[PDB]
Amino acid sequence: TPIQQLLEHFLRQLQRKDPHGFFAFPVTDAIAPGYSMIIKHPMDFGTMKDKIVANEYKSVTEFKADFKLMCDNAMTYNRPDTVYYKLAKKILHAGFKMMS
Numbered sequence: 786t787p788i789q790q791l792l793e794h795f796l797r798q799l800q801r802k803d804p805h806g807f808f809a810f811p812v813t814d815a816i817a818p819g820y821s822m823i824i825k826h827p828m829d830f831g832t833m834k835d836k837i838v839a840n841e842y843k844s845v846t847e848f849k850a851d852f853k854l855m856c857d858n859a860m861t862y863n864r865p866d867t868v869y870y871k872l873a874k875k876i877l878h879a880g881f882k883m884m885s
């Protein structure tokens with residue numbers, strides 16, 4: 786569908802900004818201790834892709850909200866001086882601008 790095509794385009798462009806794949810897959814507690822205790826609504830680019838394919842996004846607004854959730858989670862869990870926090874903040878702002 787038109788929406789699925791646009792969201793696939795946005796997702797490709799957003800993922801290009803995360804070359805290490807820090808946000809490619811759900812965060813594991815092994816990698817990030819206590820993550821599942823701290824973050825109630827996890828999100829990641831892979832989950833977003835699956836939601837596109839399942840036709841679960843009915844508006845760009847819904848997709849943007851999941852992107853923001855992913856970034857907000859990273860800025861809640863990781864301390865500001867970490868690579869993960871800095872990239873989440875950078876890609877949140879740049880990603881919203883790109884989609885506009």
Ligand SMILES: NC(=O)c1ccc2nc(N)sc2c1
Pocket residue numbers: 807808812816817858859862863869
């Ligand atoms: N999405 C995240 O918040 C995230 C991703 C990767 C990662 N690697 C760590 N050692 S902490 C951590 C957190």
